[PDB]
Amino acid sequence: SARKIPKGVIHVQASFNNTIVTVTDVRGRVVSWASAGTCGFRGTKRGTPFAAQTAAGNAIRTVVEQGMQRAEVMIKGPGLGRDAALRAIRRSGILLSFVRDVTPMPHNGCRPPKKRRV
RNA sequence: GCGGUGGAAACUACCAAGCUGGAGUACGGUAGGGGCAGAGGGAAUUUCCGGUGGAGCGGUGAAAUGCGUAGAGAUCGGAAAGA
């Protein structure tokens, strides 16, 4: 069983409502994912930093079948789950290699509504 | 107040000949999202197709409408298009 891929990039879609932590390989194929509204609590109880750690710590139950040694991290977008997702992945067992911020910086053109966030 | 006559002449005005500080022009340079037209560049968003993969995603002061196992979101590769 399993493909047994060495290292891989971890795409963390950090938003205000929730945080989707997905651990993918070298190419871009997802093995298994984990989210904030999946781990027990839902509604508005998520999106917080220590709710992101229970989400990123739920991935090591489904991706343990592959057996990854090293891991590169990748954060996208603002919110309370940027530095928190990196701390849970570190206390799990996998090593650090490349932490990058691929947040889409606009060239001042497209603008969404004002509205207050959580 | 109006008209006429005889004067005065600085000022205003008319005429003639000038002068120059006004203004204008040329010579040589400087900065600027000045304007019009035609190209081309980068990020991102949306959409279409395909791969991986899982049940959730989206949203709010809370929720719900909505999008989801005819499998989105997320992720990767490619395309199209507009600002």
CB atoms within 10 A of CB A45: 11
Task: Report the residue numbers after which chain A has a gap, meaning the C atom sits over 2.5 angstroms from the next written residue's N, or none.
Answer: none
Q: What's the token pair of residue A51?
A: 């709710």
From the Cβ of A20, is strand B under 7 Å away? yes
Residue A44 CA to residue A38 CA, distance in Å, equals: 13
Residue A90 CA to residue A64 CA, distance in Å, equals: 15
From the Cβ of A111, is strand B under 7 Å away? no
**Integer distance in angstroms from CA A47 to C1' B21?**
77
**Nucleotide in closest CA–C1' contact with A107:** B43
Residue A13 CA to residue A103 CA, distance in Å, equals: 9
Q: What's the token pair of residue A44?
A: 């508005």
Closest CA to A59 of A26, A90, A23: A23
Method: cryo-EM
**Integer distance in angstroms from CA A8 to C1' B71?**
25
Residue A84: its H or E element: helix A84-90
**Nucleotide in closest CA–C1' contact with A24:** B75
Residue A39 CA to residue A49 CA, distance in Å, equals: 14
Strands A9-14 and A70-76, bridge-based pairing: parallel
